[PDB]
Predict the structure.
Amino acid sequence: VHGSLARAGKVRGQTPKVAKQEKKKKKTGRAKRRMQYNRRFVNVVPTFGKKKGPNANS
Amino acid sequence: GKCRGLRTARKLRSHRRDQKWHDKQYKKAHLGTALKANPFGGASHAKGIVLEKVGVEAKQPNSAIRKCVRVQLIKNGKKITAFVPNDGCLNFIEENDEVLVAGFGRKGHAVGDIPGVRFKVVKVANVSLLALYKGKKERPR
Amino acid sequence: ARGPKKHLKRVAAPKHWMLDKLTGVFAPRPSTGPHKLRECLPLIIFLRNRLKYALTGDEVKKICMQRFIKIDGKVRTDITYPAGFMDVISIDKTGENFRLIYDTKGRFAVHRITPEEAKYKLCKVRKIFVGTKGIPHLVTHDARTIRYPDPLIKVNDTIQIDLETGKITDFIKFDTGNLCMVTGGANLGRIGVITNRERHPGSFDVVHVKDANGNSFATRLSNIFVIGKGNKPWISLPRGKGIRLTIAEERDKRLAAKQSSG
Amino acid sequence: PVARSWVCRKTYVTPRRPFEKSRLDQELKLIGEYGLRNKREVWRVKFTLAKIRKAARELLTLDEKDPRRLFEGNALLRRLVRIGVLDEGKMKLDYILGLKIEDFLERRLQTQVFKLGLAKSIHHARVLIRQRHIRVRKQVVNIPSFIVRLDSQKHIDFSLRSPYGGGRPGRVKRKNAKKGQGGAG
Amino acid sequence: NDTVTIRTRKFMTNRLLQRKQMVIDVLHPGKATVPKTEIREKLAKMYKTTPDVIFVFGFRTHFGGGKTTGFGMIYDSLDYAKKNEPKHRLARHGLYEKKKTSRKQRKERKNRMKKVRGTAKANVGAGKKPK
RNA sequence: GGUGACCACGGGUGACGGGGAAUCAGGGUUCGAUUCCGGAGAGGGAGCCUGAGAAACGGCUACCACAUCCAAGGAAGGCAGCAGGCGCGCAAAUUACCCACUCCCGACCCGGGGAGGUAGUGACGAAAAAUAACAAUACAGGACUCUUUCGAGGCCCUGUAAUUGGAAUGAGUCCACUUUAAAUCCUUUAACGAGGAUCCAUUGGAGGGCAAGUCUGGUGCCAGCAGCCGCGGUAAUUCCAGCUCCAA
Ligand SMILES: [Mg+2]
Ligand SMILES: [Mg+2]
Ligand SMILES: [Mg+2]
Ligand SMILES: [Mg+2]
Ligand SMILES: [Mg+2]
Ligand SMILES: [Mg+2]
Ligand SMILES: [Mg+2]
C-alpha cells in the first residue's frame, strides 16, 4: 500500500465547531400539516418574483 | 415466425426454457456458479476480521484515495476488500476487529470510481459505524 | 401415523357444527357410533352451542353424568356421542323432545317435537341380507340391525321404527313420486318429491327431485332418504319446510321481518 | 398449536411515483381542508374508494340479470346510501364510478362535528373528539375517522361527562377555582 | 347507590343444573364498575333469594363507562351450588378452599415416587427429606 | 420380453407435497421450513417384543459416532417435545404460572396433560391514534366595505411576539372496581398530572432523475460525496458545518 491513509478525517478535523442555535420546538403531526397547508395555499403575495421557491435566498 | 398450432404447447415451453438461459439474470440465479463465487454465499451481510487497512486509487476522471479494509470472513475464510463509507471512520477502525460488511449497492458490482470493491463496512466491534460517526456512542475503551 | 387418530382440530371440524376459531384449538372429536363423524352432532355442542344449557366442556360433563339425556330411547353418558340424523334427543326432566333434522342450509337445527311423536323414528335400510339358518337381516342407516323383516323391504327404503322395542311398525317404499329429504352434498337438507331415478351400472345412481316451489335438483342415490308417502311427510318438518331459497329472497325476508319488528 | 388468528390486511397503498408537484399539492389540499394527521389517512380513504370502484367495475362487466350482479349490486348500493355518500335516488352502479374521495372524507366524525357546529374548526374538531367530549347515540367515540350513517348523523352530541353537556368541569377550571378561593377570605 | 340499576336479558331456566341463566347489564352512569357483591345482593332482591347462592362473573365495562355486561347464575339451593359450579367461583365466595402446593412440586413428588418401588414407608417417605 | 426424442435411463435441486403467500389490466413471474390435510424421521443404519394398531425410539437388542459415572469389577444414554445452555452463524424469546378454557387419556362427574391456555421478551408485521385547540391585541392579505388611491372597520383567513389567558385533555404517578385458576393488560372510576403545555419526533435529503438553497463559514482533485450522470485541483448550488427548506 502507498501508505497515504494518514489523511483520514482531514477536513472534518479542520472544520470549525459552531454549535447549533437553540430554536423553538417545531410543531409535529396534524399541526405541522396545518402550518404548511396555511403557508403555501391560503396566502396571497402581492410582490412579484415569478413564483420563487420555498427556500429563496434573496 | 413462431408456431401457433393447437397442440404445440410442448414446443413453445421447451423453446422458452431453452431461451431463458440466454439472459444474465436467469443464468446467474439458476446456474449456481454465481452463488458459489459470491464471497457472502447468498447472505445480505457477513462478519469478518480486519486483516489490514489499505487505500485504493480512484478511476481516471477522479483523483482520491478510498480508505478500505481487507477483511477475512469468519465463515468460509475468504478475503475481500470492504470500503469504509464516511470521512473519518477509518480512524475508528483498528486491526483485528469484527466488522459487519455488506454489499455496496448493486449486487456484486463495483460502485462509483472505486475499482473492484463491492462491499462496505457497516459495524465495527459490534457498534454501528454511523453511531460512531455521529457520536451517539463511543468506542468500547 | 402409527394408529387411530383421537383428536380433531377446531379448523378441521365439520362446518355444520358451526364452531368458531378462538375458543380453543381442538374440536369435540366424536366417539365411534351409529353415524359418521362428518354428519353427526356430538352431544357436547348440542347442549352448549345449540341450546346453551352448558357453558363449558365440564358443565356438559355434569349434565350427562346426571342421566337426563336420552338418545333414541337410551340414556347416554358419553359427552361426545354421535347423535346423527333424525335421532330423538329426549330430555325428560325438562319435558322437551328434539328430532335431529337438517335445516334448509344443510345444517342440523333445533326441532322441538311432541312427546308422542318421539316414540317412533324413521330409518333408511342400507343392506338387506340373509343370515344363518335362513334368517333375513336388515341394517339401517344407523348401525342398528334387525332380524325377520317384511320381505317387501328392499335396499334404500325407509322403515317406520318405534323406540323401546326396535320392531318395524311400518315402512316406506322407494318409488317415483315419493317425498324425500336429501342427506348429503350441495342439496343437503332439501325436501322434495322423487321425479326420476336414472341409473348407471357400475357407478352411483342419480335421482331427480322437485320441491314444492317447483325447483328441480339432482343428487346421488346415497343422499336420498324418503320421509313421506307420496306427498305427506311422516315427520314434523322443521321451520322452512325443507325448501331452498336463493340469496335473493332471504334478504327481503329479513327486511320484511325487520320492518314488521321495527 | 396456538389458537390465534393472524388475519390482517393493510388499509392503504402508497403512490407508485414519489415527488409529483401535482399529487403532493392535491393531497395537501385535502389534508388541510379536512384536518388530517398525515398522508396515510388520505391514502387510506383513497384505497377504500379504489376497492369500491374495483368491485363496482367488476359487476358492470358482469351480464345483466345475473343473480350475483343483482344481489351484490343492491348490497353495495345499500351501504353506500346508508353511510350517506350516495344519493337515495342515485341507485345505479354507474353513479358509483363517479364518486370521489371528498364525500368519503366529509362523512368522517371530525368533519361532521365541525359542520354540525359543535366544533369551531375542523382542527378543533379532531382535538375535541380525541379528548372524549363528543358522543354518537349513547356511545362516546374518540376516533376522528368514525364514518357516520344517515341515521346516526342526527344523534351526534356532547358526552354527558364532558364539561360541555353535564357538569363536572375540567381540572384546570377546578384548580383555577380553588386558587381563587384560596387567595381571599 | 343513588343511581345504579340492574337489568336482565336472555333469561332462561334450566333444571338441568337446577338453575336459571341470564346475562345482566349494569348501569353505573358516573361510577366505576360496580363490585360483584352489590350486583349479587341486588339481583337477589329482584328474584327474592338469599344473597349467598347468586353467582355472577364476566363483567366487561363498555367504552366510556355506563353499561357493563355480565353473566348471571342463580340456583334453587346452595346444596346444588356446591354440586355443579366451577371451583374458582366457589373459592371467590369463600365456600371452597384451594390451600395446596404449586404444580411444580407435585410433579417432582410424583417423579420421586416413581424412583421408589412398592414400599409404602418409603413411597410416602419420598418427599420428607427433600423438602 | 418391458421403457424410450410425446425425452426413457442418469444426474442436480439451496426439492417434503398440497390448501395457500407476494406481485396484480389481461396473461403471467416468483414463494410456500412455518399453526390445516398427507408423508417422513427421532444421532446413522439394522433387527425385534407386546398390542387391534409400532419395524415405536420420553420400548428393547446389536453395530458405528459421540458421550456420563465407577471403588475400573461394571453400569447408564438419545431435547428434529416444553423451557433452558454450547456451537453455528447476518439471523430468531422465559430453565415463568395453570389445567380456569378447547380437547385428549384412564377403571373415570373426582386423576393427569410443557397438548393447550395465561403471563414475560418481542419496532417480524398489521389496525387505531397523541405531540395541541381557542380568543382578544398589535402589522400585512382578501372578491373586503365605507369618499372616486389617500384614512377607517359594519367582515374573513394566515402568519410573527406578548404580563397574554383561562378553558380541554391524555402520557405519567396512583384508590378502588373490573378482568383472571390467580394475576397482568384493556375498559370503568377516585386524588394528582401542561406554557419553552423543556410531558423537547425522528430518519434521510436540498445539481438532475426527484420535492427542496444558484445562503454563509471551512477544505482545496486532499478529505470526501456520488445507486447513474457527475462534484471537489482556492469564489464547491453536490464534501465538512451553521442556517433555512423538502419528503414520510
Ligand atoms: Mg431437502
Ligand atoms: Mg409446506
Ligand atoms: Mg417414525
Ligand atoms: Mg389391547
Ligand atoms: Mg426406531
Ligand atoms: Mg415527545
Ligand atoms: Mg449542506
Observations:
- The first strand of chain C starts at residue 69 and ends at 71.
- Residues 174-244 of chain C form one domain.
- The interface with chain D takes residues 10, 21-25, 246-248, 251 of chain C (CB under 8 Å).
- The radius of gyration of chain C is 20 Å.
